[PDB]
Amino acid sequence: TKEREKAKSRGTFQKLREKQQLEEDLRGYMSWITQGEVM
Amino acid sequence: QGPHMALRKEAERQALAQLEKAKTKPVAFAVRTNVGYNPSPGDEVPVEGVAITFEPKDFLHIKEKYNNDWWIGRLVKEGCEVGFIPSPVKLDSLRLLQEQ
Amino acid sequence: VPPYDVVPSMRPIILVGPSLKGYEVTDMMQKALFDFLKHLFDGRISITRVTADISLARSSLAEVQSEIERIFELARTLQLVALDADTINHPAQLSKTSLAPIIVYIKITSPKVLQRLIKSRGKSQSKHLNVQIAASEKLAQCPPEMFDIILDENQLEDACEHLAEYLEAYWKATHPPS
């Protein structure tokens, strides 16, 4: 019942899943950079 | 009659002739259209129902010139086949006739 | 208003974005795509550098015209044609030519991601951050219909597959069964 009182931060997971989407692209595009250099 | 339907049914045979023969020919050139076209009966297509249809900004591959009014080619699109394309003078003539 | 404009028998592929050409992020990301196509379409493709400023249809009029004629000739036998065109950063740049390109937008959805990518190249590239960020924002404001293909996939292999699927379908559209 203590933890039901912190479930109201639903707008903060909306910021979180954007950031892990930003970490998803940034590693991926950098491999896009990486496998163009050694070719 | 079948006085007349000797020539104007031998013309249709001679047109379908060239059309099958252009199927194997190379592309002479391509055009991007600035106008649309869909054949009406009064357009007098060398083989009825064998005119191609297109919208503005479509691409056409032209194989050969059938006569002054019609080219032979295809819409650049999967499934689309060879047919008759109205020449610029034929397009102009259809508009002018329509106005008259 | 003539009803028909003569264009190449195969529309030349041109890459724009994710920012300005002549900087590392864009040049290297596009380079990986050119190298993929070279093998993916081997035997059916030519990929050629265009240094002359073909948006002018600087480079003289004759130099531009001869590059334009060369691109038409490359497409005459219905092989895929891909241009590495240094000066072309925006689709509106070729709109007044009769090249009729297939315009491929290599799109980075997040400006923050593009900024981080530029910074990853070192301060020599990060010096030019703003001009690259401004250019990417301009592409992002274009209506999507200005582009023939939009590659917004974050993995090279997914972007390549999307572009290859599009060009394979274009191959079919230009090569009807006998």
UniProtKB/Swiss-Prot annotation, chain A:
Location of region: Binding to the beta subunit: 20-37
Signal peptide stretch: none
Q: How is it modified after translation?
A: Phosphorylated. Phosphorylation by PKA activates the calcium channel. Both the minor and major forms are phosphorylated in vitro by PKA.
* Location(s), subcellular: Cell membrane, Sarcolemma, T-tubule
Q: What does this protein do?
A: Pore-forming, alpha-1S subunit of the voltage-gated calcium channel that gives rise to L-type calcium currents in skeletal muscle. Calcium channels containing the alpha-1S subunit play an important role in excitation-contraction coupling in skeletal muscle via their interaction with RYR1, which triggers Ca(2+) release from the sarcplasmic reticulum and ultimately results in muscle contraction. Long-lasting (L-type) calcium channels belong to the 'high-voltage activated' (HVA) group.
Q: How does it assemble?
A: Component of a calcium channel complex consisting of a pore-forming alpha subunit (CACNA1S) and the ancillary subunits CACNB1 or CACNB2, CACNG1 and CACNA2D1. The channel complex contains alpha, beta, gamma and delta subunits in a 1:1:1:1 ratio, i.e. it contains either CACNB1 or CACNB2. CACNA1S channel activity is modulated by the auxiliary subunits (CACNB1 or CACNB2, CACNG1 and CACNA2D1). Interacts with DYSF and JSRP1. Interacts with RYR1. Interacts with STAC, STAC2 and STAC3 (via their SH3 domains). Interaction with STAC3 promotes expression at the cell membrane.
- Report what the protein is called: Voltage-dependent L-type calcium channel subunit alpha-1S
Source organism per UniProt? Oryctolagus cuniculus (Rabbit)
Name the lineage.
Eukaryota, Metazoa, Chordata, Craniata, Vertebrata
UniProtKB/Swiss-Prot annotation, chain B:
This protein's name: Voltage-dependent L-type calcium channel subunit beta-1
Which organism is this entry from? Oryctolagus cuniculus (Rabbit)
Q: Which residues form the SH3 domain?
A: 26-95
Q: Tell me how the protein is altered or processed after translation.
A: The N-terminus is blocked.
Q: What does this chain do?
A: Regulatory subunit of L-type calcium channels. Regulates the activity of L-type calcium channels that contain CACNA1A as pore-forming subunit. Regulates the activity of L-type calcium channels that contain CACNA1C as pore-forming subunit and increases the presence of the channel complex at the cell membrane. Required for functional expression L-type calcium channels that contain CACNA1D as pore-forming subunit. Regulates the activity of L-type calcium channels that contain CACNA1B as pore-forming subunit.
The gene for this chain is CACNB1
Subunit structure as annotated in this protein's UniProt entry:
Regulatory subunit of L-type calcium channels that consist of a pore-forming alpha subunit and auxiliary beta, gamma and delta subunits. Interacts with CACNA1A, CACNA1B, CACNA1C and CACNA1S. Component of a calcium channel complex consisting of a pore-forming alpha subunit (CACNA1S) and the ancillary subunits CACNB1 or CACNB2, CACNG1 and CACNA2D1. Identified in a complex with CACNA1C. Identified in a complex with the L-type calcium channel subunits CACNA1C, CACNA2D1, CACNB1 and one of the gamma subunits (CACNG4, CACNG6, CACNG7, or CACNG8).
| Signal peptide region | none
Where in or outside the cell?
Cell membrane, Sarcolemma; Cell membrane
Protein family per UniProt: Belongs to the calcium channel beta subunit family.
Curated annotation (Swiss-Prot), chain C:
Q: Where in the cell is it found?
A: Cell membrane, Sarcolemma; Cell membrane
Which residues does UniProt call coiled coil? none
Q: Which cysteines are joined by disulfide bonds?
A: none
Per the record, the domain of life is: Eukaryota
Q: How is it modified after translation?
A: The N-terminus is blocked.
The UniProt entry's sequence similarity note says: Belongs to the calcium channel beta subunit family.
The function of this protein is: Regulatory subunit of L-type calcium channels. Regulates the activity of L-type calcium channels that contain CACNA1A as pore-forming subunit. Regulates the activity of L-type calcium channels that contain CACNA1C as pore-forming subunit and increases the presence of the channel complex at the cell membrane. Required for functional expression L-type calcium channels that contain CACNA1D as pore-forming subunit. Regulates the activity of L-type calcium channels that contain CACNA1B as pore-forming subunit.
Q: Can you state the subunit structure given in the record?
A: Regulatory subunit of L-type calcium channels that consist of a pore-forming alpha subunit and auxiliary beta, gamma and delta subunits. Interacts with CACNA1A, CACNA1B, CACNA1C and CACNA1S. Component of a calcium channel complex consisting of a pore-forming alpha subunit (CACNA1S) and the ancillary subunits CACNB1 or CACNB2, CACNG1 and CACNA2D1. Identified in a complex with CACNA1C. Identified in a complex with the L-type calcium channel subunits CACNA1C, CACNA2D1, CACNB1 and one of the gamma subunits (CACNG4, CACNG6, CACNG7, or CACNG8).
Protein known as: Voltage-dependent L-type calcium channel subunit beta-1
Q: Which residues of the full protein are shown?
A: 265 to 461 of 524
